[PDB]
């Protein structure tokens, strides 16, 4: 094991702002430390939401190293909660098209996603390096950096590509380190689509924390 470990399965959020963070950005920022479950925003505010994981290692790792920092300006407000589960209601389309209410425990694209992987694989605070897997095995820093052109995020400092064989995908590093500039590239370049007009081809990567010394 690794760290202390949470009283709850769930959360709580505020402060945060429905069309830069929403069900998708707090999934991008937090699954990395374990499978979510589901999320809903809450008292139909646009700055106020609730989470919950597979399990309480994974809230353990917000609540001790998340908590209290922000993406995109936004002032901080986080809590844990004693609620067993999210609760159900009344859910509508969100400003940026994503509804008020999502579920990822149908997720197969995480080596935690089952109690079987998890018990091969471990959780850690960031390591002021970053992971990237799942991409096609025609990207390179050149499309990193015209990405992150559109989503005005900050361009990372070096970066590691290697594609497998027969695998027809890529994976690799990127190392730089900022507190607002790492955390707004992970909620916006997680699980994210490229460039191309129509989607005709899958592009949707991941982003994680590894133990690193180098991009290479």
């Given at each position: 094991d690794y760290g202390p470990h949470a009283d709850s399965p769930v959360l709580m959020v505020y402060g945060?702002?429905?069309?830069?963070?929403n069900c998708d950005r707090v999934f991008n920022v937090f699954c990395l430390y374990g499978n979510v479950e589901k999320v809903k925003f809450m008292k139909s505010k646009p700055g106020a939401a609730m989470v919950e994981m597979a399990d309480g290692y994974a809230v353990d790792r917000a609540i001790t190293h998340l908590n209290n920092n922000f993406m995109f300006g936004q002032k901080m407000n986080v809590c844990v909660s004693k609620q067993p589960a999210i609760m159900p209601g009344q859910s509508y389309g969100l400003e940026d098209g994503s509804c008020s209410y999502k579920d990822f425990?149908?997720?197969?694209?995480?080596?935690?996603?089952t109690p079987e992987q998890a018990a091969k694989n471990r959780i850690q605070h960031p390591s002021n390096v970053l992971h990237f897997f799942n991409?096609?095995?025609?990207?390179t820093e050149e499309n990193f950096f015209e990405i992150c052109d559109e989503l005005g995020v900050k361009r990372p400092t070096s970066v590691k590509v290697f594609s497998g064989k027969s695998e027809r995908s890529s994976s690799g590093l990127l190392e730089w380190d900022s507190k607002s500039d790492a955390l707004e590239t992970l909620g916006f370049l997680n699980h994210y689509q490229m460039?191309?007009?129509?989607?005709?081809?899958p592009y949707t990567l991941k982003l994680c924390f590894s133990t690193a010394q180098h991009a290479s």
């Amino acid at each position: 094991d690794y760290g202390p470990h949470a009283d709850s399965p769930v959360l709580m959020v505020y402060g945060l702002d429905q069309s830069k963070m929403n069900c998708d950005r707090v999934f991008n920022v937090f699954c990395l430390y374990g499978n979510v479950e589901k999320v809903k925003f809450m008292k139909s505010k646009p700055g106020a939401a609730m989470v919950e994981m597979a399990d309480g290692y994974a809230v353990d790792r917000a609540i001790t190293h998340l908590n209290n920092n922000f993406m995109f300006g936004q002032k901080m407000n986080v809590c844990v909660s004693k609620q067993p589960a999210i609760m159900p209601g009344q859910s509508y389309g969100l400003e940026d098209g994503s509804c008020s209410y999502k579920d990822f425990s149908e997720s197969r694209n995480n080596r935690f996603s089952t109690p079987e992987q998890a018990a091969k694989n471990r959780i850690q605070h960031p390591s002021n390096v970053l992971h990237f897997f799942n991409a096609p095995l025609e990207v390179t820093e050149e499309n990193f950096f015209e990405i992150c052109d559109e989503l005005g995020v900050k361009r990372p400092t070096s970066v590691k590509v290697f594609s497998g064989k027969s695998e027809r995908s890529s994976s690799g590093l990127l190392e730089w380190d900022s507190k607002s500039d790492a955390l707004e590239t992970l909620g916006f370049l997680n699980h994210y689509q490229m460039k191309n007009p129509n989607g005709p081809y899958p592009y949707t990567l991941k982003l994680c924390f590894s133990t690193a010394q180098h991009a290479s």
